Enzyme design. Structure first.
Site, PDB file in Angstrom:
ATOM      1  N   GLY A 199      -0.969  -1.515   6.910  1.00  0.00           N
ATOM      2  CA  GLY A 199      -2.359  -1.513   7.350  1.00  0.00           C
ATOM      3  C   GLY A 199      -3.276  -2.312   6.429  1.00  0.00           C
ATOM      4  O   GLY A 199      -3.783  -3.381   6.796  1.00  0.00           O
ATOM      5  N   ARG A 200      -3.485  -1.785   5.227  1.00  0.00           N
ATOM      6  CA  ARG A 200      -4.297  -2.460   4.220  1.00  0.00           C
ATOM      7  C   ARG A 200      -3.670  -3.806   3.863  1.00  0.00           C
ATOM      8  O   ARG A 200      -4.364  -4.816   3.704  1.00  0.00           O
ATOM      9  CB  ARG A 200      -4.495  -1.558   3.011  1.00  0.00           C
ATOM     10  N   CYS A 227       0.885  -1.145   0.000  1.00  0.00           N
ATOM     11  CA  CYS A 227       0.000   0.000   0.000  1.00  0.00           C
ATOM     12  C   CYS A 227       0.927   1.200   0.000  1.00  0.00           C
ATOM     13  O   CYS A 227       1.817   1.255  -0.857  1.00  0.00           O
ATOM     14  CB  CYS A 227      -1.016  -0.091   1.150  1.00  0.00           C
ATOM     15  N   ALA A 285       2.428   2.498   3.196  1.00  0.00           N
ATOM     16  CA  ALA A 285       3.401   2.072   4.208  1.00  0.00           C
ATOM     17  C   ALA A 285       3.693   0.579   4.198  1.00  0.00           C
ATOM     18  O   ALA A 285       4.715   0.146   4.721  1.00  0.00           O
ATOM     19  CB  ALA A 285       2.943   2.503   5.579  1.00  0.00           C
ATOM     20  N   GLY A 286       2.800  -0.211   3.623  1.00  0.00           N
ATOM     21  CA  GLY A 286       2.970  -1.645   3.581  1.00  0.00           C
ATOM     22  C   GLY A 286       2.547  -2.384   4.824  1.00  0.00           C
ATOM     23  O   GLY A 286       3.016  -3.513   5.005  1.00  0.00           O
TER      24      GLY A 286
END
Length: 284
Positions: free
Chosen positions: A223-224, A218, A220-221
């Site tokens: 959360g999603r 995403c 930041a890598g």
């Protein structure tokens, strides 16, 4: 052995969502595992390769680039499905920066990754969340000795599907990658439409090849990407009549890349989605 039946784990989850205890436990869970070093990510020559100053890979599970500068903000995340003799492999990474696109494509090339799942738009509220590391067709892009072209681009309500041809310029070897960009899921939030999300995860599952990692990112890598990994894991468990404990799935991700599943809303969402998939699975 199973601590409960799948049915029992789902009754527990439903009860805990209603009472609030499930979210309380999530809020209590560590964000970063105690005792895993984070050093390479903070070296002076690597600081500008992190999109977010404090979203950093552990030393032990970071993806290594060959040669000189070995650093990319990316982590191996592998989810084991108990005695199903099954491990689902991922590489979880940030949205590339203009100057890390070459390293991103190097990872894709060196590991011949055939699927990239991108869970962000390029911008939100005018702020860039990810650099566009692929060319608009028919344009061509050159990143670190790789030649990238977009062969096809097709849209659906929630995501864009692109086929990318990656050519090693020196040798002319070719590698095809399917790129899926989910555009209906805001940063720190939940998918705009739960049904569209579940269809998408089913689609991702249909493209997974055993023992090949799926690259997920995403901005930041964490959360999603963490929500997607949790949901795929849960679908594998449901199908197998194995109990599902989302807090343990999140812990097991976080032991590999810190902070995966960032917000309470994200966790609540995925827990609700898990109950839905469970109930639908009983029907067929």
């Amino acid at each position: 052995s199973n601590a409960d039946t799948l049915e029992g784990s789902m009754a527990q989850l439903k009860k805990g969502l209603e009472s609030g205890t499930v979210l309380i436990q999530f809020e209590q869970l560590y964000r970063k595992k105690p005792g895993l070093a984070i050093t390479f990510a903070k070296l002076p020559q690597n600081l500008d390769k992190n999109r977010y100053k404090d979203v950093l890979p552990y030393d032990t599970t970071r993806v290594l680039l060959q040669g000189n500068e070995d650093y990319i903000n990316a982590s191996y995340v592998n989810m084991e499905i108990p005695a199903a003799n099954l491990v689902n492999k991922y590489i979880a990474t940030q949205g590339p920066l203009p100057h890390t696109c070459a390293q991103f494509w190097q990872v894709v090339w060196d590991q011949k990754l055939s699927l990239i799942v991108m869970l962000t738009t390029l911008t939100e509220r005018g702020r860039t969340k990810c650099h566009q590391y692929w060319p608009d067709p028919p344009d061509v892009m050159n990143h670190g000795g790789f030649h990238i072209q977009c062969q096809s681009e097709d849209c659906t309500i929630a995501y864009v599907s692109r086929e990318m041809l990656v050519t090693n310029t020196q040798t002319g070897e070719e590698h095809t990658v399917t790129h899926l960009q989910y555009v209906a899921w805001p940063e720190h939030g939940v998918p705009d439409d739960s049904s569209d999300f579940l269809e998408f995860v089913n689609y991702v599952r249909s493209l997974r090849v055993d023992s090949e990692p799926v690259l997920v990112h995403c901005s930041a890598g964490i959360g999603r990407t963490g929500v997607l990994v949790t949901m795929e894991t849960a679908m594998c468990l449901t199908e197998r009549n194995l109990p599902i404990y989302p807090l343990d799935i999140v812990r097991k991700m976080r032991d590999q890349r810190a902070m995966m599943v960032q917000t309470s809303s994200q966790y609540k969402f995925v827990c609700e989605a898990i109950l839905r998939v469970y109930e639908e699975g009983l029907v067929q």
